[PDB]
Amino acid sequence: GPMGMTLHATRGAALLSWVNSLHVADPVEAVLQLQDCSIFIKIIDRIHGTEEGQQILKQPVSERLDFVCSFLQKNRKHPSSPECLVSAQKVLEGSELELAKMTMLLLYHSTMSSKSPRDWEQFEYKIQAELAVILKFVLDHEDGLNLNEDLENFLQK
Numbered sequence: 001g002p003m004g005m006t007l008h009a010t011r012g013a014a015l016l017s018w019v020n021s022l023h024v025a026d027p028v029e030a031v032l033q034l035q036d037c038s039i040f041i042k043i044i045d046r047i048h049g050t051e052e053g054q055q056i057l058k059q060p061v062s063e064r065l066d067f068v069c070s071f072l073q074k075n076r077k078h079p080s081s082p083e084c085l086v087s088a089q090k091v092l093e094g095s096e097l098e099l100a101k102m103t104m105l106l107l108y109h110s111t112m113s114s115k116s117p118r119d120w121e122q123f124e125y126k127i128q129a130e131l132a133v134i135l136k137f138v139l140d141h142e143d144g145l146n147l148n149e150d151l152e153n154f155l156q157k
């Protein structure tokens, strides 16, 4: 097939910095380290204030992944859209780009949650700048109908 779109280093670096700032796990340094969905489950648990995730951590990666993709589908602004936001297939094939889309959407849902506002000042300015751009993209597009294409173009930079 034609070559896929790629994740820009600055976009991945900011998303990883955000993930690490949640302290739901030991540090991660590459987006592929999110593939096992463990951190993603912990992030959803943090959003809910519940422990449902703890039961799903016992399941295999494909089941963990379905759980996360289901959360993202359930919580989108138009649950009735035909294109799903995330390809479970591409995640199982090791797509950092698809894992970054997951992480970005969980950033969105975290910022809309009951948790206290993040201290954005904790990040290096380069990272603050990228996070600002990421959250502006969410503001400007998350409720659109070409979101999937738009998000991929954004993440490739």
Ligand SMILES: [Cl-]
Pocket (backbone or CB within 6 Å): 107, 110, 111, 118
């Ligand atoms: Cl946050």
